[PDB]
Amino acid sequence: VADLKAFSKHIYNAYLKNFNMTKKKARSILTGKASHTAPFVIHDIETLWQAEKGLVWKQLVNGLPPYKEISVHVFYRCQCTTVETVRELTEFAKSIPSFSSLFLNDQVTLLKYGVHEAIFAMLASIVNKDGLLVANGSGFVTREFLRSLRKPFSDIIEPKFEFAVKFNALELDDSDLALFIAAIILCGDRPGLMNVPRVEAIQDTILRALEFHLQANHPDAQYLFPKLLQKMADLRQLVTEHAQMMQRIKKTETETSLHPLLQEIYKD
Ligand SMILES: O=C(O)CCCCCOc1ccccc1CN(C(=O)c1ccc(-c2ccoc2)cc1)C1CC1
Ligand SMILES: CCCCCCCO[C@@H]1O[C@H](CO)[C@@H](O)[C@H](O)[C@H]1O
Numbered sequence: 001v002a003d004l005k006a007f008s009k010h011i012y013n014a015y016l017k018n019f020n021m022t023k024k025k026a027r028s029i030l031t032g033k034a035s036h037t038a039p040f041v042i043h044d045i046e047t048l049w050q051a052e053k054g055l056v057w058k059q060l061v062n063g064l065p066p067y068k069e070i071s072v073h074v075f076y077r078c079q080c081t082t083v084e085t086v087r088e089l090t091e092f093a094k095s096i097p098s099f100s101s102l103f104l105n106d107q108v109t110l111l112k113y114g115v116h117e118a119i120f121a122m123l124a125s126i127v128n129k130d131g132l133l134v135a136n137g138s139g140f141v142t143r144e145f146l147r148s149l150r151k152p153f154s155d156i157i158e159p160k161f162e163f164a165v166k167f168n169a170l171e172l173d174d175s176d177l178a179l180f181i182a183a184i185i186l187c188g189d190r191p192g193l194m195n196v197p198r199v200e201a202i203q204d205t206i207l208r209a210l211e212f213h214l215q216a217n218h219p220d221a222q223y224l225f226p227k228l229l230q231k232m233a234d235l236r237q238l239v240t241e242h243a244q245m246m247q248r249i250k251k252t253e254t255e256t257s258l259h260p261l262l263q264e265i266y267k268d
């Protein structure tokens with residue numbers, strides 16, 4: 001048990017070193033306790049335009065694919081963030097010694113099949129029932145606005161809110177999440193994995209570490225560990241549905257570009 005604390009703290013440090021925003025930072029912004037200035041609320045076309053003229057985005061607008069329409073534009077911003085988060089997750093995983101010890105092709109397999117599950121878990125951190133943070137916490141896009149986008153773009157967004165609000169009710173902190181996300185990435189079930197026994201062994205250790213961490217950090221929280229195992233299963237279903245919806249976008253939205261890295265993740 002005492003051995004897992006060291007293991008856990010290293011994973012937490014990898015998390016702190018590699019992710020742009022913590023849940024702690026996100027919730028302070030969402031509750032209006034973080035700074036002297038509040039996020040700019042994006043809730044319609046006019047405010048989206050004002051945000052693109054005003055807020056500082058990690059990805060410059062000029063850099064996005066040529067403009068098509070509002071729903072597609074919002075989709076392109078979603079892809080921006082997805083790809084950036086894949087980069088952060090890759091570095092997080094590499095800051096974990098037992099992941100970096102795997103052959104590079106298994107690293108790629110784990111990331112390919114794990115990153116969307118991790119993304120949608122981490123998404124909950126910047127979400128509340130009314131919308132989500134964008135542009136490093138400088139903006140807040142309302143759930144209502146995102147609902148108003150045309151199908152298929154509104155359809156691919158709303159189920160993530162449904163998941164997030166339920167996930168946030170578990171009240172995990174950043175140290176819980178670091179272990180949770182590591183367990184999603186270090187998953188021995190992924191297709192085409194070469195060294196399955198090594199990955200299963202690492203996953204098992206992470207989950208033992210997660211169990212012990214939760215007993216210490218959430219001493220009154222009954223059933224939290226099994227609840228999180230179930231959330232892992234729920235994320236797999238969420239990502240299956242997500243991938244199906246992405247296949248439909250590829251089929252029916254032929255004018256919409258998909259980022260080369262995401263094409264490789266979704267290469268069927
Ligand atoms: O599958 C892929 O990899 C790309 C396809 C993802 C499509 C589904 O993206 C969703 C769905 C639900 C909730 C959040 C996102 C995307 N997202 C975001 O952080 C995000 C959301 C909205 C905006 C935005 C900017 C201006 O107006 C709106 C910017 C960023 C986080 C998952 C990474
Ligand atoms: C940056 C980490 C995340 C990478 C995710 C993208 C993985 O794409 C896959 O790359 C493999 C190695 O090139 C190919 O053999 C596969 O066909 C392809 O699907």
Ligand SMILES: CCCCCCCO[C@@H]1O[C@H](CO)[C@@H](O)[C@H](O)[C@H]1O
Pocket residue numbers: 059064065076077079080081083084087257258259260
């Ligand atoms: C083709 C559709 C493109 C939609 C917009 C996606 C842009 O994503 C950005 O592309 C860069 C180049 O890889 C990454 O380095 C950044 O991290 C990422 O934020």
